[PDB]
A paper describes a structure:
Epidermal growth factor receptor (EGFR) is a receptor tyrosine kinase (RTK) and a member of the ERBB subfamily of growth factor receptors (EGFR/ERBB1, HER2/ERBB2, HER3/ERBB3, and HER4/ERBB4).1 Ligand binding to the extracellular domain of EGFR promotes formation of homo- and heterodimers, followed by tyrosine autophosphorylation, and activation of several downstream signal transduction pathways in control of cell proliferation, apoptosis, and cell death, among other cellular processes. EGFR ex20ins mutations constitute a diverse set of in-frame insertion or duplication mutations of 1–7 amino acids located between positions 762 and 774 of the EGFR kinase domain. Mechanistically, it is hypothesized that ex20ins mutations “push” and “lock” the αC-helix of the kinase into an in-state active conformation that promotes ligand-independent EGFR dimerization, receptor activation, the constitutive activation of downstream signaling pathways, and oncogenesis.
To further understand the ex20ins mutant potency and selectivity vs WT-EGFR observed for 23, X-ray cocrystal structures of 23 with the EGFR ex20insNPG mutant and WT proteins were obtained. Next, the lactam of 23 forms a hydrogen bond network with catalytic Lys745 and Asp855 of the DFG motif. Next, the lactam carbonyl also forms a key intramolecular hydrogen bond with the aniline NH, positioning the aryl ring alongside the Thr790 gatekeeper residue, where the 2-OMe and 3-Cl substituents occupy a hydrophobic pocket formed by the Leu788 and Met766. The lipophilic nature and asymmetric shape of the gatekeeper pocket helps rationalize the previously investigated aniline moiety SAR.
Residue numbers in the entry: 701 to 747, 755 to 770, 770A, 770B, 770C, 771 to 990, 1015 to 1020
Write the structure that this text describes.
Amino acid sequence: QALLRILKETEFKKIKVLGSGAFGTVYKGLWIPEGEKVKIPVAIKELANKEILDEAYVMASVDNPGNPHVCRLLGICLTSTVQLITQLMPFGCLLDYVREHKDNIGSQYLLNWCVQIAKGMNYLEDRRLVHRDLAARNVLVKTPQHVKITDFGLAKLLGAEEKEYHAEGGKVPIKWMALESILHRIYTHQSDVWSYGVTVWELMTFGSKPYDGIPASEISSILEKGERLPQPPICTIDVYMIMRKCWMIDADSRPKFRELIIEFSKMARDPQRYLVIQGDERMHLPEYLIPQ
Ligand SMILES: COCC[C@H]1CNC(=O)c2c1[nH]c(-c1ccncc1F)c2Nc1cccc(Cl)c1OC
């Protein structure tokens, strides 16, 4: 059962703006619980009220048992707007992190992040949840060795006798969506596997924009012609074939998140065999459009 903890605005202090975009506005602060005096660093989101409360319901529904690689909602705050509260991730989003530390990320970190995103997505698949927005921008970095999936804005829960979600005319990310989602607005856990492949391609290219220069309306025709995202220079054939298996026309032929945990975990045990990065031993660490 989903339960929300209504937190008072007087409990939050030192609110500073982290960023803004399609997600709305994300801030950072210090949550002092009532009675307790432990200053917990937290993040606050804003944007209309109908949309942010759907996100809170989705996050609260999948909170028990919970997964270490999935962001969990601490509670909500009722100021002039409805705000979401979660544990702060000090190192920000992974898309910016891979673009900032281009020359310091080793093969072990890239493969472990792929394992962790697949562990989080497999947990969401078990809780009948289709994320519908898996991208490097929606992956946060708690510490360089630990990542979490975020932004349950487009996420939808599936009923017991429901294996797919049909969207209406809302804005959606075309360059991360599967071909069936662009053509027929159909969203399954296998459509999230396509987005997982695009997210893996983003990490392997250190934050390259997918299909750069190509407009969103030309993507369906490009994917029907057999064209896919290119092989990143650091990827061996085994890593690139996983990405290409995530982008197959038949959604059931694509890999499963439980299979991607095993495949990338095997690769993480011998990382230099599967990714070729210069000076790997020396390294050390401490969009949306209307469909038609
Ligand atoms: C600043 O924007 C980065 C990407 C942005 C993209 N979309 C997000 O949803 C989000 C982002 N940052 C953080 C975030 C979280 C935790 N610590 C730091 C951070 F920045 C997000 N989650 C988030 C923020 C506040 C409350 C809740 Cl319940 C959240 O989970 C949905």
